[PDB]
Design an enzyme around this catalytic site. Sequence first.
Site, PDB file in Angstrom:
ATOM      1  N   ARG A  78      46.293 -21.041  56.225  1.00 21.60           N
ATOM      2  CA  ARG A  78      45.821 -20.021  57.148  1.00 21.60           C
ATOM      3  C   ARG A  78      45.984 -18.662  56.480  1.00 21.60           C
ATOM      4  O   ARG A  78      46.756 -18.504  55.531  1.00 21.60           O
ATOM      5  CB  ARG A  78      46.563 -20.072  58.496  1.00 21.60           C
ATOM      6  N   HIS A  96      58.697  -9.848  73.015  1.00 23.79           N
ATOM      7  CA  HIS A  96      58.488 -11.278  72.812  1.00 23.79           C
ATOM      8  C   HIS A  96      59.809 -11.985  72.531  1.00 23.79           C
ATOM      9  O   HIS A  96      60.117 -13.019  73.139  1.00 23.79           O
ATOM     10  CB  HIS A  96      57.496 -11.494  71.666  1.00 23.79           C
ATOM     11  N   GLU A  97      60.610 -11.436  71.616  1.00 22.60           N
ATOM     12  CA  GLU A  97      61.882 -12.065  71.282  1.00 22.60           C
ATOM     13  C   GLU A  97      62.858 -11.983  72.451  1.00 22.60           C
ATOM     14  O   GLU A  97      63.623 -12.924  72.698  1.00 22.60           O
ATOM     15  CB  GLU A  97      62.472 -11.415  70.028  1.00 22.60           C
ATOM     16  N   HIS A 126      62.081 -14.598  75.002  1.00 22.78           N
ATOM     17  CA  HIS A 126      62.473 -15.945  74.598  1.00 22.78           C
ATOM     18  C   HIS A 126      63.776 -16.365  75.268  1.00 22.78           C
ATOM     19  O   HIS A 126      63.966 -17.548  75.577  1.00 22.78           O
ATOM     20  CB  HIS A 126      62.613 -16.026  73.076  1.00 22.78           C
ATOM     21  N   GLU A 152      55.941 -19.916  74.118  1.00 18.17           N
ATOM     22  CA  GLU A 152      55.457 -18.820  73.292  1.00 18.17           C
ATOM     23  C   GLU A 152      54.431 -17.958  74.015  1.00 18.17           C
ATOM     24  O   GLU A 152      54.385 -16.741  73.793  1.00 18.17           O
ATOM     25  CB  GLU A 152      54.863 -19.376  72.002  1.00 18.17           C
ATOM     26  N   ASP A 155      54.582 -14.106  74.658  1.00 15.64           N
ATOM     27  CA  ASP A 155      53.479 -13.213  74.307  1.00 15.64           C
ATOM     28  C   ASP A 155      53.034 -12.378  75.505  1.00 15.64           C
ATOM     29  O   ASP A 155      52.701 -11.196  75.359  1.00 15.64           O
ATOM     30  CB  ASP A 155      52.298 -14.021  73.762  1.00 15.64           C
ATOM     31  N   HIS A 177      53.243 -22.194  68.724  1.00 18.29           N
ATOM     32  CA  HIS A 177      52.469 -21.011  69.059  1.00 18.29           C
ATOM     33  C   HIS A 177      51.016 -21.392  69.297  1.00 18.29           C
ATOM     34  O   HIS A 177      50.518 -22.383  68.758  1.00 18.29           O
ATOM     35  CB  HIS A 177      52.526 -19.969  67.942  1.00 18.29           C
ATOM     36  N   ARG A 209      46.073 -16.318  71.328  1.00 20.93           N
ATOM     37  CA  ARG A 209      47.143 -15.437  71.777  1.00 20.93           C
ATOM     38  C   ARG A 209      46.572 -14.125  72.290  1.00 20.93           C
ATOM     39  O   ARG A 209      47.054 -13.574  73.286  1.00 20.93           O
ATOM     40  CB  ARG A 209      48.133 -15.184  70.640  1.00 20.93           C
TER      41      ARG A 209
END
Length: 696
Positions: A49, A530-531, A534, A593, A597, A658, A664
């Site tokens: 990718r 985002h973190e 989590h 995830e 997001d 993800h 996303r």
Amino acid sequence: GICKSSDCIKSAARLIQNMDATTEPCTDFFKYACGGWLKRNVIPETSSRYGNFDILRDELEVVLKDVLQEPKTEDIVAVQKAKALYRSCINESAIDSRGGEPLLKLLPDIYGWPVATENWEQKYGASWTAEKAIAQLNSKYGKKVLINLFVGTDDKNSVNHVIHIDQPRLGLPSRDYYECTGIYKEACTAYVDFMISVARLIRQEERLPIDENQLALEMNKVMELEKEIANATAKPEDRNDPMLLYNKMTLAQIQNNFSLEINGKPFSWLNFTNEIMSTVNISITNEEDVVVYAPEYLTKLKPILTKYSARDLQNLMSWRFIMDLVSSLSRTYKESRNAFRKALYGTTSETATWRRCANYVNGNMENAVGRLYVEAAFAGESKHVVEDLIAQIREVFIQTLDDLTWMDAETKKRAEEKALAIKERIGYPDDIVSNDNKLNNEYLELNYKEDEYFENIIQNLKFSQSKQLKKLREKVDKDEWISGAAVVNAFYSSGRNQIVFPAGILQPPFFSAQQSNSLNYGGIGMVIGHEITHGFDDNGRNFNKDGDLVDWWTQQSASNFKEQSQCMVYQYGNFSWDLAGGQHLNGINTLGENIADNGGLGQAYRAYQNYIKKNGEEKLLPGLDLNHKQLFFLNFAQVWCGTYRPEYAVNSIKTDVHSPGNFRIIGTLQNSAEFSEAFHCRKNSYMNPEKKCRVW
Ligand SMILES: CS(=O)(=O)N[C@@H](CCCCN)C(=O)NC[C@H](CC1(C(=O)N[C@@H](Cc2ccc(O)cc2)C(=O)O)CCCC1)C(=O)O
Ligand SMILES: *[C@@H]1O[C@H](CO)[C@@H](O)[C@H](O)[C@H]1NC(C)=O
Ligand SMILES: *[C@@H]1O[C@H](CO)[C@@H](O)[C@H](O)[C@H]1NC(C)=O
Ligand SMILES: *[C@@H]1O[C@H](CO)[C@@H](O)[C@H](O)[C@H]1NC(C)=O
Ligand SMILES: *[C@@H]1O[C@H](CO)[C@@H](O)[C@H](O)[C@H]1NC(C)=O
Ligand SMILES: [Zn+2]
């Protein structure tokens, strides 16, 4: 009234060049934000990718090349070892002249590879047991086969370490591959072809007769064995709840409730675990507490292994280790992996050797290499600005608890407690630069020879495993960083309640002390939220403020969390990925995830609103008919500009938790009224569905 600084100009140029304005923002914001970039670029032959993240990582590899390739007279020992390890890895000439001889010397120590041995049953089968064979690969070379036993943190007591027992990884990306039909057929064929190729090269190098039908026979029984093991493993969908996954019991209980008859001998969990833990002079008794994460898999495993022989098992056992080593031998052994590599990743060429090596040295000596990377490429000014941003985001999350209508007061109070207790790591640990003694001692037990690359990597496997096994009886070090600094990512640890933002990700488009705030918030701000989120997703919500797996939710607030998050399950589960053959995304395995997001981007936006309130509008960028609210979303979308090879799309749709970058962007913005507001999007346009999901 426009900003014209050098830093504003680079921001605008990058934004303009990457976007495609001839697309409607409300029809497809991925193409609007990333159309320019996709048309200009093609995935390299060495990449599965490619996108913003990948480019920044290849750039980081260059910095590592510059700092690793030239020795310096002032280097401390820790640094000398990393450079010596890099130099041994890139020699290649020295590696090729060794052929497979490094591997041949190693096979007697793992009870051999039957397909490449003669009279294996008389040489090893005599003194052979599942307990000893599996343990030798686990404790010395860190290769976990059949039964993955490792030392980890106790989910219900984040200060201690406990022995975990879980199902093992498979040779192919996921259990789905072992159907071996349609899209998985080529991969299955290359895998067994890969086996026979290596088995043939070893026997050739040992001057042994080659019976091509006997090779096909044994290696296909290995595949019919791993097929069985694969089908016995639990789905990811069925391993999502850590509460149900946590099954503590003693070794005596394991022997009673999970027996195994392998090669006639009854399996002894006490002899297996002591064979492993003796590697560091540690004794284990039947009263040892053990956490079993795959009990269902252990029961289905009992009647699988009664069928197969010691030879049949060892052929798979050693193959799982040889599989990873051929890449470290001569180009004849490197090439045997081509068709298998291309099947799983789509890549026709192998990454540059200096790129592979820089990454290897960074992965095994992350503090020594992080020191070299920050000294050369990291500011230091940046560290304090991000602290400020994490402070703003953490408060926006707490502030937002009050507006949430699906949580009761008592669960909100305890949600705020965890949030306030989250520990932050920014940039790099200061002592990897200042304390030369502590860094040299991290690698003191290591000694690298420059012409012996294969011996160095084996040293690192044993060192890496020996140090993890020694942690059983010690307390979790709290000062420890969960990531090196020379990394372009960010992380959250539920067991430590700790968010980390390495120096590698503290650069544009994510962050810069000189780029517009709308970009910083849409970039690193969204990553920070985002973190943080989590710690509150379908998995992190089960851990309290101290990393302990404990319920702190009311029956009602838990039930509602599932209710709110079911919207996102259906949303992403309805996305089809053309690159993966129209297959649907797994909305369950990606839920955590997509929650992060969606919560993260929401938290960052509300932090940018709060900033404008206290400070006001900063000047607009040139060449862009966009205000700063739209710039916020543009930069967030441009973080994910990328694309996948079809072969790897098939791989990642099963193995990546993800969503693909494009989804996303669309999934997150579809749920954001603020995006549609900023871009004046019609109602029920693709980017502004009237039905919108939201958890955090
Ligand atoms: C126990 S653990 O700590 O190890 N849990 C992991 C779980 C995933 C492991 C992947 N390493 C973890 O936290 N990983 C970090 C990751 C960071 C973010 C991320 O999306 N990063 C992507 C980057 C990428 C790379 C190539 C590409 O083409 C497109 C995107 C990724 O890594 O795929 C950064 C922005 C928001 C999350 C997260 O938070 O999930
Ligand atoms: C690579 O190894 C060989 C053999 O040890 C040695 O002669 C050669 O100098 C090495 N290459 C470099 C660049 O040092
Ligand atoms: C896969 O495992 C399930 C559960 O034990 C079993 O019912 C099924 O027959 C297995 N499939 C094959 C092909 O063995
Ligand atoms: C495990 O059993 C084998 C015999 O099969 C024995 O040789 C070995 O010493 C035992 N290991 C431990 C740690 O008890
Ligand atoms: C698509 O959305 C509908 C509506 O909620 C849902 O019933 C269906 O299960 C979703 N599809 C997938 C594959 O998740
Ligand atoms: Zn994440």
